[PDB]
Amino acid sequence: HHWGYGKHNGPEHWHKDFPIAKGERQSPVDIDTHTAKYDPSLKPLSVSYDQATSLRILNAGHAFNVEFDDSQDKAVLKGGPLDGTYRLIQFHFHWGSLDGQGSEHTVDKKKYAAELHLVHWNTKYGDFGKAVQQPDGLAVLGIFLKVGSAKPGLQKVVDVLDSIKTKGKSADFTNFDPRGLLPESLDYWTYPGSLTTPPLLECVTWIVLKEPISVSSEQVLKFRKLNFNGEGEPEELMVDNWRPAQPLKNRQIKASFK
């Protein structure tokens, strides 16, 4: 039936409806730190989120998304391996049922408790829909979450989850500053990949940060109380909404640091 993360509709079944699932540049992948190539040509990342305008938080079924106004260059990502300006449209997370799993990308096979994805699209394409049809249409910033000390900047997100427990529910979410979710350092790995959920389009430049952010056990616990199901339906907890690592194939992962 509809795709998901269950036993009968999980990632291993996706290829039946989305053949590209077995493509040449699928994500996520395992980052082998000893095989990554240091590239002195890579520029520092430029994150300009000072004018970011968040609008709403939505339970999309497979995750919850925090949406931003992308009708102007308010919150953009530039530099790094990117050519052009990419506007932030939304961010969401992937997490597990236990602290030992949850992230999509892994580092030397190590899994993190969760993974934050800040999605941006290339403005030269006019809109997000056009952008996903291009090889350099999207730029996704990936940040790992490890369980430890609480992240003050994440609490605002945590407190509103009760209002969007089931699929389809949304709530106004204005004046949220995404800068509170960034680690201290912006050193990264980068490689050409895809969207990790259907339609799995191979239109993404991945920028995965080396430094994880820490969140508290209580904070991640609240993520696990969300439901995949819609109201009035049998409760299915939203956990383990991550896709396992895919073959790197003929791709090279580059590092901005040595």
Ligand SMILES: [Zn+2]
């Ligand atoms: Zn994602």
